[PDB]
RNA sequence: CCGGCGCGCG
């Protein structure tokens, strides 16, 4: 990445192959040469013996069928009979290796996952100061090592230092020091100050120092707080080595770099344990730094942080796959052993800890998620997230109020823009275009390097740690500038010790030159970002993601020229693998021959993702044309010629229009709609599975007893509705029944549309009966519609609150209605400028047949950049198509346009264009909800949750507020009883609504108030209401 | 104390009070600083 | 399993005058470039469309001009891009271009000249 | 509707004064700047200006 | 028809 954008999956791709080379090979050893008790039979792998053969399914297999894309592991081993003094090496089976696509994600049951980055605190040495209750301050020193263990060092207020482990476990630095068998005499001398730690020394503790095993004791005494005197013993140290020391000890490779720095130390590299000078080195800081030597370390800084890629989340579950495998061993030696049997070396090992471990973390692991495939840019981005939670990282409430915040050390490796919204905002981060993980944890960007005469600088582009970030002067501004002086002189601003300067071209070392250098790809596909607020940026970048692919795309007028960089990088179109030349194309394959090797490129034709959104893919080449391997051979869905096309370039005004555009309401018009401009591919999926009960398995028969066969219509003679037939709300989908009452598969609400696939599949078992699973996918065309939501790339969205006719629409001075009327007021409120000038451009590049690929912050150039670019292309589309109203001398980018309801014009000229709009799936059809009555919940009898549930709305309490504010009794009263879960009187309602006849009150207590009582009752509380009379004074108890 | 430190940095440190030849506003910096900030 | 990027193979003065002297069966394109020279991008594209274009019927090699320098003055390249179409038949003589030319003219250059 | 406010990139009026506050504030920061480099003042001085 | 985890919308 020196000369060029990288790969935006380079990351992913480097990960898993860095695991493969040295993941594999490093997890393979630590496995302990296994021997029994009697250690008459020795099992051992032979880990240079270790390999990995092919998948046997093909990828595409094991998406279809629902397995997982693994590849096999052949490690040998030999088992050692000490009683026949005999060796056997057979190649003997561990288990499945994941394997990752070109794309970078897995496939597990069927499913494509995606492990995501993740950054936690770096090991070392971290230097803090918390004040007191009094404001004393109270400086602190912690150990971090390569599993988190922190050990904590602590000056009181009587200067005493204690190796803080828990909240209440406090151990004092000498009992620790000793512990570990310094002696009492070089602990002084090795410090400055001998006299602070001797003042310290009552006369219990120097009797414990003065002996190595007395320290021992005296500090699990205290580590442990549990009374009485302990014994030493091997197994007490070993006990106290897992728990402290393999916990707290352990720096590793990282953690000694960063504690030989920060306490400048000259210790050597491959030292990875926690040294004891390092304790006695740190406390020689912290009781200095105490007087004004050094400054404090700051935790929200990159330095001190480390990013955890696929290579170390899949060799750490390599990890706990063999140490579950040798507990399978020792059970099974141990077994076999009592039946004085010699078993193979294959019987020994089974394949389960490595495929169920693997199977199970991409299953349950949060890093571990399932790829969002919507449009070609969500596959990309998902992968390149970093996030501050899952284990070992803070949660949301845990997270700091100074986390979540932009650091200097940031610029260039995280974006500033692109994070999550809600709880886990500032939490959930994303890498920068150009960003790079380096060898270290740490992330890397490029800078170019300006340096002397005398030195050769084969290459000037280095990437640069965080670590070493702050101690460059890094500038962003260019070199057109000269005064009667020299070039050297002049000013620019620059980046120096995370703040900002503004210094002389001769004393700048660094310079950010590429475009997209600080932003992610969601924020790289905004036109003219500079001219948007910030806060604008972050919704835009949220929105492209949720763009559906239209039926028909088309490429943007105006762009980035980063679509052509997305759309290569998501795998939607088809890339050669080999050149030659093109022989046969058409819609199900691609054929394409070279240097004696003719291949077979199958293309997706209407496929779903896991957002029931289409998949399809058209050639883009012709029969007799030449490639180069490398070069595009179709395109995909949101993909023409090569670039990522989430939208359409629609005729577009920006003018209030009778309301319509109240808000954020959008107004079209037909032609949108009979055009199918914004019209979409919808696939949904509905399974049903076959169980085995114990009144017998279901059976799936078109047979069903008290159904009409006006359902059962589009089914086949095996009981599954037939390929290519128009279901209905309602209609039968798979006719199955329980022994038998009916359990057969149903079409929901709204999911008319027209079946596409069937996948009638057994899963081969070891049971007499096998799981026989039915997947029918039903497409549905959406036009857009009243309620759906459109948005443009500059945090412009809305909802389409009317549709038009076209002779209704407002018209250009060449007779042409718009397309879209947008309200004028939404600009300045939400401060996008940025969209005024994708509109006017765009209209200029229609007409005169051009696209523009234009960088951000053009305005480097010259002032006013972005403005002498459009108002120039406005003008000579003006002139060349002689058409003076698409640049207006008076007020350019604007025109007067003519009322269609009447032919006069609006008084004002309005700002028209063709920018780019997309289709959001945020629509109606899955989010209009009805319920008058039906299922409730088992225990608290109230209407379910959820659309798909047929359930009901929640009136919550700041809902009752409301209607207590109003004084509305009895409005309150039917949301409380017989509406949610009176359960005699809901019967009653329904009962008197059909006859209407008057609903009395309910009067008595809802199953909420009787589910309260008896779990009172298990707690021995009785809870009893009682009705006195005003009457006679009669105490009643009511039924409760 | 301020004698002997002085004395020590001169033997040891090759401190000497050399004078600094100082533009008017240098000179009005230091005069004027000593007094307070407005 | 990994096919290579790059068809154009880049030989050395001494290889080159091995090709020249051996027996020939195809037209042999000689391409003389330099990393630092902003046209040879375009001229190294087009050389490597035209080896995909003839894929036995031609032998397109590229000889660096910071490697070969005195060699490429001795066989007269006044700039750079500088091609050489060298006939397999001995008798002919060979054909030096100029400039970006197309890739058409290279590829009537080499039907109807080699 | 009738009268169709709208908003244009000439529209966003810059008061016609900008480029002249602008001008005599970098010239005042250019100044501060050479002599803080001559240490006439010193760095608090500079950052408050 | 039960709870956790992850991702989203207003």
Redesign the pocket.
């Known amino acids: 990445g020196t000369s060029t954008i990288p790969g935006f999956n380079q990351i992913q791709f480097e990960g898993f192959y860095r695991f493969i080379d040295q993941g594999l090979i490093e997890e393979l050893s630590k496995f302990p040469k296994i021997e029994d008790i009697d250690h008459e039979i020795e099992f051992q792998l032979f880990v240079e013996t270790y390999q990995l053969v092919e998948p046997l399914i093909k990828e595409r297999d094991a998406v279809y069928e629902s397995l997982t894309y693994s590849s096999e592991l052949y490690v040998s081993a030999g088992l050692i009979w000490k009683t026949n003094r005999n060796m056997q090496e057979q190649r003997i089976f561990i288990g499945n290796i994941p394997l990752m696509n070109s794309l970078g994600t897995f496939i597990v049951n069927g499913i494509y996952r995606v492990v995501i980055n993740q950054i936690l605190q770096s090991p070392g040495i971290y230097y803090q100061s918390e004040l007191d209750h009094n404001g004393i301050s109270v400086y602190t020193g912690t150990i971090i090592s390569d599993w988190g263990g922190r050990l904590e060092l602590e000056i009181d207020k009587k200067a005493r230092i204690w190796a803080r482990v828990s909240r209440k476990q406090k151990i004092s630095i000498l009992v620790l020091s000793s512990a570990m068998g310094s002696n009492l005499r070089e602990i002084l001398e090795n410090v400055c100050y001998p006299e602070i730690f001797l003042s310290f020394l009552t006369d219990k503790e120097k009797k414990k120092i003065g002996s190595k095993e007395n320290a021992i004791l005296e500090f699990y005494q205290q580590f442990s707080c549990v009374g009485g005197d302990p014994i030493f013993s091997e197994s007490l140290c070993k006990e106290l080595q897992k728990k402290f020391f393999h916990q707290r000890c352990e720096l590793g490779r990282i953690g000694r770099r960063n504690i030989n720095w920060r306490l400048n130390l000259n210790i050597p590299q491959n030292n990875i344990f926690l040294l004891p000078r390092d304790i006695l080195a740190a406390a020689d800081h912290l009781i200095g730094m105490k007087f004004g030597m050094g400054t404090l370390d700051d935790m929200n800084h990159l330095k001190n942080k480390r990013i955890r890629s696929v290579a170390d989340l899949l060799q750490d579950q390599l990890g706990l796959a063999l140490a579950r495998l040798e507990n399978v061993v020792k059970g099974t030696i141990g077994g076999a052993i009592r039946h004085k049997l010699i078993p193979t070396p294959q019987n020994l090992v089974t394949s389960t800890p490595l495929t169920t471990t693997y199977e199970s973390f991409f299953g ?3 890093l571990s ?2 790829l ?1 495939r919507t449009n070609p840019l969500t596959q990309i981005v998902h992968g390149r ?1 970093l ?1 501050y ?2 284990p070992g990282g803070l ?1 949301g409430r845990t997270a700091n109020f100074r986390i979540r915040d932009i650091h200097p050390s940031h610029y260039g490796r995280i974006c500033p823009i692109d994070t ?3 709880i ?1 905002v500032g939490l ?1 981060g994303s890498l920068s275009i150009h960003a790079r993980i380096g060898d270290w944890g740490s992330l890397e960007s490029p800078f170019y390097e300006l340096v002397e005469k005398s030195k050769k600088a084969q290459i000037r582009m280095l990437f640069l740690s965080p670590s070493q970030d702050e101690y460059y002067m890094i500038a962003a501004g260019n070199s057109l500038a000269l005064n009667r002086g020299i070039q050297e002189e002049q000013v620019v601003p620059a980046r120096y010790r995370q703040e900002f300067l503004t210094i002389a071209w001769e004393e700048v070392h660094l310079r950010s030159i590429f475009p997209f250098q600080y932003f992610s790809i969601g924020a790289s596909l905004i036109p003219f970002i500079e001219h948007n607020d910030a806060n604008r940026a972050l ?1 835009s970048s ?2 492209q ?2 763009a559906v692919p239209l039926s028909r795309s088309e490429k943007c007028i105006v762009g980035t020229g980063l679509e052509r960089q997305v759309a290569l990088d998501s795998g939607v179109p088809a890339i050669a693998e080999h050149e030659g030349k093109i022989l046969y194309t058409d819609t199900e394959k691609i054929i394409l021959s070279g240097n004696e090797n003719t291949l077979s490129i199958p293309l997706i034709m209407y496929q779903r993702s896991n957002k029931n959104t289409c998949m399809h893919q058209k050639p883009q080449v012709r029969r007799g044309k030449c490639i180069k391997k490398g070069q595009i051979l179709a395109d995909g869905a949101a993909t023409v010629g090569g670039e990522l096309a989430l939208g359409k370039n629609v005729l577009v005004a920006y003018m209030p229009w009778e309301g319509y555009n109240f808000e954020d309401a959008v107004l079209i018009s037909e032609c949108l709609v009979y055009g199918d401009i914004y019209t979409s591919f919808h696939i949904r999926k509905y399974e049903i599975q076959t169980h085995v009960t114990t009144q017998g398995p279901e059976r799936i028969t078109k047979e069903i007893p008290h159904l009409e066969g006006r359902l059962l219509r589009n089914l086949d003679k095996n009981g599954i509705v037939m390929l290519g037939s128009w279901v209905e709300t309602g209609d039968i989908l798979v006719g199955k029944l329980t022994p038998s009452k009916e359990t057969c598969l149903k079409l929901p609400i709204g999911g008319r549309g027209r079946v596409i696939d069937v996948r009638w599949v057994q899963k081969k078992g070891g049971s007499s009966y096998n799981p026989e699973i039915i997947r029918v996918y039903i497409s549905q065309k959406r036009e857009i519609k009243v309620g759906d939501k459109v948005a443009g790339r500059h945090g412009n ?1 809305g909802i389409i609150s009317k549709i038009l006719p076209r002779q209704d629409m407002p018209y250009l001075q060449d007779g042409r209605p718009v397309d879209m009327v947008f309200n004028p007021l939404g600009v300045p409120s939400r401060m996008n400028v940025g969209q005024i000038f994708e509109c006017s451009l765009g209209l200029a590049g229609s007409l005169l047949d051009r696209h523009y690929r234009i960088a951000p912050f053009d305005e480097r150039y010259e002032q006013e950049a972005s403005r002498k670019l459009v108002f120039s292309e406005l003008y000579e589309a003006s002139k060349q198509t002689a058409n003076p109203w698409v640049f207006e001398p008076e007020y350019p980018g604007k025109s007067r346009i003519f009322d269609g309801r009447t032919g006069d014009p609006f008084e004002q000229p309005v700002i028209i264009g063709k920018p780019y709009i997309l289709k959001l799936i ?1 629509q109606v059809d899955d989010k209009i909800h009805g319920r008058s009555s039906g ?6 009898q109230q209407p ?2 959820g659309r798909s ?1 047929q359930g009901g709305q929640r009136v919550g309490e700041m809902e009752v507020w409301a209607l207590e504010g109003f004084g509305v009794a009895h409005i309150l009263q039917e949301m409380l009883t017989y509406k949610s879960d009176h359960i005699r009187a809901r019967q009653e309602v329904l009962g008197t609504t059909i006859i209407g006849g008057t609903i009395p009150k309910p009067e008595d207590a809802p199953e909420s108030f009787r589910l309260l009582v008896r779990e009172l009752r298990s707690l021995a509380l009785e809870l009893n209401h009682f009705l006195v009379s005003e009457k006679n004074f009669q105490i009643n108890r009511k039924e409760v | 104390t301020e004698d002997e430190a002085r004395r020590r940095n001169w033997i040891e440190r090759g401190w000497a009070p050399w004078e600094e030849i100082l533009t008017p506003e240098a000179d009005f910096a230091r005069k004027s600083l000593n007094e307070g900030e407005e | 399993f990994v096919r290579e990027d790059y068809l154009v193979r880049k030989l050395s003065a001494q290889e080159l005058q091995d090709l020249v002297k051996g027996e020939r069966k195809v037209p042999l394109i000689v391409d003389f470039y330099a990393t630092w020279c902003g046209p040879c991008i375009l001229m190294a594209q087009e050389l490597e469309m035209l080896a995909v274009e003839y894929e036995s019927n031609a032998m397109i090699v590229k000889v660096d001009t910071d490697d070969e320098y005195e060699f490429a003055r001795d066989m007269q390249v006044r700039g750079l891009p500088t091609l050489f179409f060298i006939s397999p038949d001995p008798s002919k003589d060979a054909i030096r271009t100029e400039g970006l030319i197309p890739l058409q003219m290279m590829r009537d250059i080499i039907d109807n000249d080699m | 509707t009738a009268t169709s406010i709208s908003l244009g990139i000439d529209d966003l009026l810059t008061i016609p004064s900008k480029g002249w506050l602008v001008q005599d504030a970098e010239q005042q920061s250019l100044i501060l700047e050479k002599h803080h480099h001559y240490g006439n003042v010193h760095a608090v001085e500079k950052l408050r200006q």
Do not use: C, F
């Open positions: 349950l692991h949060p998620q399932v969002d997230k996030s939670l899952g949660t999550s919204e809600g886990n959930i919704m949220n929105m993601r949720q969205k945020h299922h409730y919940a088992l225990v608290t379910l949750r549930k």
